[model samples]
Target: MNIFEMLRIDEGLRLKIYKDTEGYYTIGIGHLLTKSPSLNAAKSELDKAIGRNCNGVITKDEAEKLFNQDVDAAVRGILRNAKLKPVYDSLDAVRRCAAINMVFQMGETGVAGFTNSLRMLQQKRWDEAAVNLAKSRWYNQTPNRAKRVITTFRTGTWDAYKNL
Candidate 1:
């Protein structure tokens, strides 16, 4: 088997959503449901799904396939958002990637709550957007990541992304 197949075994395979060793909702080869929309929604589905339970399991191939599809949908949704389309496209690749990652972490609507930051971005006020981003709760949760993203917003370079 290939390394990809081995990685699936290492993660463990479960067809249904269940609390992992750390107590976070997880499923499909250890995909965590902390905040990702698809995973969270998958948890909700597990409750309503027929023939699935805490003890249920699925084929590794099935789990891996589903995982890929969900991630694909998420990235597609981020790039397709009507509100974000123009803004996302206007950015250079570096900032576009930062925007995509931000949307992935906090759903597009959730990111919309950063009105000042979005406004600055729309106005091409790069430095202002970076400052406004630091003022958000997102920054509070992950100050280091916020700094990197902010730097990208300000400088259009990925220098701060060294370790990420």
Candidate 2:
């Protein structure tokens, strides 16, 4: 199933969820309910968060808290239902989940086709990992696919290809 299908919410709801919560960044999700529309500003903030995390200045947990609507407990609940503990444990549990959730919040492929980058992250190759992340962002501009790809990446896998 597609992301919308997987999310079990309609397009309007998905957009509403994104808009309501803003969008996800490297650290977490974000949005601003204001008179003026500033998706650009939000996107820029996201970029800043991504940049900071990439540099190891801020942490994935901090970033997630910056924008995620889900509380730690709620996320854990859904995670348990999803049976995500295996991968979570394999990757160091909460830390990995935070990292994965952050990427999922971004709504595009951070890990898709990012084997080399994942390898780099495994090796602590921050620079290489950032490049790979940017590469995914480069092609994730199209609306539908980015979020799904990002979700896939967050889950630590990739589909062979996607329209987006």
Candidate 3:
């Protein structure tokens, strides 16, 4: 399956986490990442990080503080990109690296947040690109986080735009 299909962001699991008001981690409700994930151990941690029901939704503030602690033990296992090695296909390689880095940086749910936005960029919709890039900042739950750069994957739009 493609990265997007494998991640199942279109589903309701909303596996990504965001900071809540109380500085705790909570799944972003009303998003597809909330749906149950299909990956292996990835699903387990997600379930543990987020409960089966709706009560686990914590404040964005709390999630920022609590996230590292929650994922510390699993970071290496989860983030390792060894499986995607020997990528002969540039597209596949890029996708695999993107998926790994995305999970490492943003977690499963955070990756989901970029799904449609990524698609829009692929279509070369520059206006939509700007919108989605900005939206990613909010979901990322990190202050001073850089906006999504579509060009990083293909066009080098950052340099072209100059003022972004």
Candidate 4:
């Protein structure tokens, strides 16, 4: 098999931690750690450098803080792409939010590769942009999410997946 297929087989596209065949602690496809992760382990690692617990389960407030930071970073990521920056700035709040969500999922560079869709977006052709987004390989991988994003693009409002 090719390298891509081999990696997929090894990693299995998991979102949560699991033990590999060799009993290594792994998460997010292939992030192997020497031992199983614990709440305290996370808290301890960050305690000294960041002055926060890395080993304990985080509170809802802490999680929300992290989430917000991620969202902000995703928006910044999208805005930094030269090919997409001007087009993104011209969009309304709802459309801009949807674009940010897309960047969060696909990465800024990946979303920037959607040349036709970005062009349509730049032209303010909402319907065409929605159609173009719906035709992507990403759509097939996550139809429900694509539906929400497409709806947002089509109508220029937050329809689903609103929290990023």
Candidate 5:
């Protein structure tokens, strides 16, 4: 659970449903409660997911289950993406984790938005990739996690997660 643990640290945990940085209703380790931007849909979907009413509380056991499934879905989404799959495959293990981390935090479509950054990454232009990533709104939104993931991309090391 090396990557799993790293992701858990990055995502942290919330037993109660809350809005994420992008204002989407999220629950239990950043699992999105809605596909659309509708708050009502998020409430209903979360309630339906946990088989309960909308008090916004989730059990630790259920959160873990949701976390696992979300990570799996993240992995599948990254690998199946025509644009990201090649860049993902070209990286080493730690760098691959960085790529997966980004895909997990954002979605595959979100990562695909970084055209120049992905190009730099594909070409092994580490510094350019980091700088390019740093220029994005995602960097402004989650500065700490963005820095750690970008550092991993630049250095190909798990040093960012070492303290965790």
Candidate 6:
């Protein structure tokens, strides 16, 4: 499966405006309404995608399209980072996906904070990378997702994320 598919499964498809774990209003597959440049921009684009003004609930296609938008933006955000681009490009596809998946949820700045882990990944020290990734509040907050990424880094496969 591709990163988008994996993420769609990992993030869970949401149709309504639900509060995230942190209580921010979110919609359509983990799209944080608060993070959009503006809720107006988000609603506008969402309306454009679905060809209708967004109410409370969205169709499955709209949710999938919204997720695609978020994930693609996350990938570009990762690559746009001068410090992170090389690290990201050095990985195999699955590892690349894992990293993008990290940025997809955590934001580029959040994942960029993993200085030691980034170095380990760049140097191809998979075990060290995984270890470094685990030594963070992120792991504590989302152990299951962290474990899947850690296993991908260590094993260079999505075997840990069998949900795909």
> Between 1 and 3, whose lDDT is larger?
1
lDDT of model 1, residue 60: 65
Candidate 6 collision pairs: none
> TM-score of predicted model 3?
0.30
Return the top candidate by lDDT: 5
- Tens digit of lDDT per residue, candidate 3, span 40-143? 33335445654543333445443433444433422344444333222212233433433343454455545545656556544656567556656655535542
Better of 1 and 4 by TM-score: 4
RMSD of 5: 2.0
- Which of 2 and 5 is the better model by TM-score? 5
Worst 10 residues of 6 by lDDT: 35-44
Cα error, residue 70 of model 5, in Å, equals 0.8
TM-score of each: 0.62, 0.29, 0.30, 0.65, 0.90, 0.87
Clash totals, every prediction? 0, 14, 24, 9, 0, 0
lDDT of 1 by residue, 1-164 (tens): 22233224334567766765545666685565554445546555544432355334445665776556545554677677777777777877777767765664566787766777877887889988888889888789767656766887798776665543
Taking the tens digit of each residue's C-alpha lDDT, what string does model 4 give over 1-164?
A: 22222223323444333565546444333433335456344334434423554442344444334445556677788777898798889888777767876775667899999999999998989888888898888898767767877787778865354443
Name the lDDT value of residue 26 in candidate 3: 34
RMSD of 4: 10.4
Per-residue error (Å), model 3, residue 12: 33
* Model 1 ranges off by over 4 Å: 1-31, 34-71
Give the alpha carbon lDDT tens digit for every residue of 122-161 in model 6: 9999888888899999889889878987898899987987
Best by TM-score: 5
- Residue 91 C-alpha lDDT in model 5: 85
Q: What is the Å distance of residue 118 in model 3 from its true position? A: 2.5
In order, candidate lDDTs are 0.64, 0.39, 0.40, 0.63, 0.88, 0.82
After superposition, candidate 6 runs with Cα above 4 Å error: 35-52
**Worst ten in a row by lDDT for model 1:** 1-10
